[PDB]
Amino acid sequence: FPATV
Amino acid sequence: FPATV
Amino acid sequence: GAMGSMERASLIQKAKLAEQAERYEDMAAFMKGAVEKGEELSCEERNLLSVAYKNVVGGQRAAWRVLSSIEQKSNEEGSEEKGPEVREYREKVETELQGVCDTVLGLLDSHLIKEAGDAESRVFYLKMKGDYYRYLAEVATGDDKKRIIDSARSAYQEAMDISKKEMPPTNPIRLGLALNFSVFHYEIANSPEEAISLAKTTFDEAMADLHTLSEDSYKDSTLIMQLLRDNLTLWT
Amino acid sequence: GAMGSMERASLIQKAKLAEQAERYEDMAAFMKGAVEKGEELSCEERNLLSVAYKNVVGGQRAAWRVLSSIEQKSNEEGSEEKGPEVREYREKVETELQGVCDTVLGLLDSHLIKEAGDAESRVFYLKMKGDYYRYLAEVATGDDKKRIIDSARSAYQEAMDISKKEMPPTNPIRLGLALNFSVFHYEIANSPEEAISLAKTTFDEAMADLHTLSEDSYKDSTLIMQLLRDNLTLWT
Numbered sequence: 389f390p391a392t393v
Numbered sequence: 394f395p396a397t398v
Numbered sequence: 399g400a401m402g403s404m405e406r407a408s409l410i411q412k413a414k415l416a417e418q419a420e421r422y423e424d425m426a427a428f429m430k431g432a433v434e435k436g437e438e439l440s441c442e443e444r445n446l447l448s449v450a451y452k453n454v455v456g457g458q459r460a461a462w463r464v465l466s467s468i469e470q471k472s473n474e475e476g477s478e479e480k481g482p483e484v485r486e487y488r489e490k491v492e493t494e495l496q497g498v499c500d501t502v503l504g505l506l507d508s509h510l511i512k513e514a515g516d517a518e519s520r521v522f523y524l525k526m527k528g529d530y531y532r533y534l535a536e537v538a539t540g541d542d543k544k545r546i547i548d549s550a551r552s553a554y555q556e557a558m559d560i561s562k563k564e565m566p567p568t569n570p571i572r573l574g575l576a577l578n579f580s581v582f583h584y585e586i587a588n589s590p591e592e593a594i595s596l597a598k599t600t601f602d603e604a605m606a607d608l609h610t611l612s613e614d615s616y617k618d619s620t621l622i623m624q625l626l627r628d629n630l631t632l633w634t
Numbered sequence: 635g636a637m638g639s640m641e642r643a644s645l646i647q648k649a650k651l652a653e654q655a656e657r658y659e660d661m662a663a664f665m666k667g668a669v670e671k672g673e674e675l676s677c678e679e680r681n682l683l684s685v686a687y688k689n690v691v692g693g694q695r696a697a698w699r700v701l702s703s704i705e706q707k708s709n710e711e712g713s714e715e716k717g718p719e720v721r722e723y724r725e726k727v728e729t730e731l732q733g734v735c736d737t738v739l740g741l742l743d744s745h746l747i748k749e750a751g752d753a754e755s756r757v758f759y760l761k762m763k764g765d766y767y768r769y770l771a772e773v774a775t776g777d778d779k780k781r782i783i784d785s786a787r788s789a790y791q792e793a794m795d796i797s798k799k800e801m802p803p804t805n806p807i808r809l810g811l812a813l814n815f816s817v818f819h820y821e822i823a824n825s826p827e828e829a830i831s832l833a834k835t836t837f838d839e840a841m842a843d844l845h846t847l848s849e850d851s852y853k854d855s856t857l858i859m860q861l862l863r864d865n866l867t868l869w870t
């Protein structure tokens with residue numbers, strides 16, 4: 389899964 | 394803290 | 399609201415304690431109570447709100463993915479019929495997740511966004527609106543899936559437009575917004591080229607403005623820039 | 635009970651799914667529903683029950699300790715008065731913890747223990763009874779603290795007596811019971827010598843019986859023996 393903030 | 398199961 | 403009798407300051411204090419204790423459900427409930435007092439939130443308070451719900455929904459999303467994977471396998475050829483239980487339990491978790499998303503969207507609509515005039519607050523809330531519609535999109539399979547996706551897109555786009563006009567390219571809210579909208583493109587909108595373009599342009603424009611920053615601001619910006627790079631590495 | 639309309643088998647199935655998803659509150663609720671069907675639990679089912687509540691209460695205990703530490707610091711000389719919020723929130727978490735303990739004790743009393751005739755089931759449940767009174771003891775500060783402690787001791791002692799008569803010294807339930815009763819002595823009963831004696835004797839008697847075991851049984855026993863050794867190392 390890609391990074392989110 | 395000591396181990397418990 | 400069960401928090402209606404507690405002081406705003408006490409709710410904030412307890413949200414901070416709950417964070418220290420990793421009691422994110424409690425933290426979220428306290429912050430919901432604080433919002434419902436009706437006063438605008440400071441920067442610190444906005445962060446408490448976002449941290450709390452991010453942790454709550456993050457756990458729900460992880461569980462939903464476990465359960466959806468099991469369900470998927472159950473529907474492969476040669477899988478033994480095990481009855482309705484996997485679907486029912488995935489539905490339960492899904493409904494609770496949607497409920498959390500609706501609660502957050504409700505707070506933003508009543509009335510956080512409309513009272514947020516400064517760019518930093520308005521962009522922060524609109525990013526959240528995009529994020530929680532994105533989480534709704536992740537589990538959407540029906541007639542409204544398109545409209546949910548468009549709701550996410552529209553919120554992100556308004557945030558982007560304001561952030562480009564009003565904030566420097568190294569601003570951590572602007573960076574984190576771009577990071578997440580890029581993921582929206584890749585994972586939700588089936589637009590990997592758009593995702594990659596966005597992450598690259600955002601990274602490069604931030605790089606060029608790093609020279610203007612203090613050591614502390616530099617740390618904050620470069621941390622998010624590394625997340626953009628991590629995604630780009632994943633996608634290329 | 636909200637689980638009253640769900641099949642026993644469906645509750646068990648869902649407890650297993652909840653475990654896979656790390657949804658321990660759900661897992662515990664499903665297992666509570668299963669117990670309340672009124673049938674005895676198999677070994678696998680007893681383990682689902684114990685895993686679920688151990689995880690739930692384990693999280694509550696960790697949070698309670700964070701909050702109690704903060705509260706302790708607030709009551710040191712030179713600490714600024716911050717109002718009732720830390721005490722109130724520690725109380726909230728404490729009450730929820732006590733509630734979970736009371737729920738588990740309730741299940742054991744109605745009617746798991748009285749229907750458990752085989753040594754392995756009766757010892758398993760009595761160990762749980764000791765453990766959940768121990769958790770109550772950890773937060774007890776009042777008039778009943780002695781009686782809570784004695785309740786834990788009495789349950790552990792009955793379990794010990796049965797386990798010594800009826801199970802081999804390498805039996806993992808017997809080992810885990812001894813491990814926990816040893817911790818009860820050290821941490822609750824202010825009896826570190828008793829704790830150390832118990833852990834040592836249990837370890838040595840298990841060592842001597844390892845030769846009788848299959849490779850698989852050997853793995854299970856030696857794992858718990860290592861926990862006894864770890865405690866002894868901590869305490870000496």
Ligand SMILES: *CC(=O)NCC1CCN(C(=O)C(C)(C)Oc2ccc(Cl)cc2)CC1
Binds near residue numbers: 393441522573621
């Ligand atoms: C009120 C305010 O300015 N909040 C934003 C800050 C930005 C930096 N924060 C972070 O934790 C990191 C992960 C470095 O970056 C973020 C987090 C959250 C968002 Cl929305 C953007 C960037 C603390 C909150």
Ligand SMILES: *CC(=O)NCC1CCN(C(=O)C(C)(C)Oc2ccc(Cl)cc2)CC1
Binds near residue numbers: 676680681807857
């Ligand atoms: C029904 C039954 O026999 N349950 C007990 C087993 C013993 C081994 N288990 C374990 O996970 C380890 C940690 C190795 O040891 C334990 C766990 C729990 C207890 Cl109460 C004692 C020992 C699986 C359950």
Ligand SMILES: [Mg+2]
Binds near residue numbers: 405
């Ligand atoms: Mg007031």
Ligand SMILES: [Mg+2]
Binds near residue numbers: 489492493
């Ligand atoms: Mg649904």
Ligand SMILES: [Mg+2]
């Ligand atoms: Mg562009």
Ligand SMILES: [Mg+2]
Binds near residue numbers: 642
């Ligand atoms: Mg039936």
Ligand SMILES: [Mg+2]
Binds near residue numbers: 725728729
């Ligand atoms: Mg109390």
Ligand SMILES: [Mg+2]
């Ligand atoms: Mg002895």
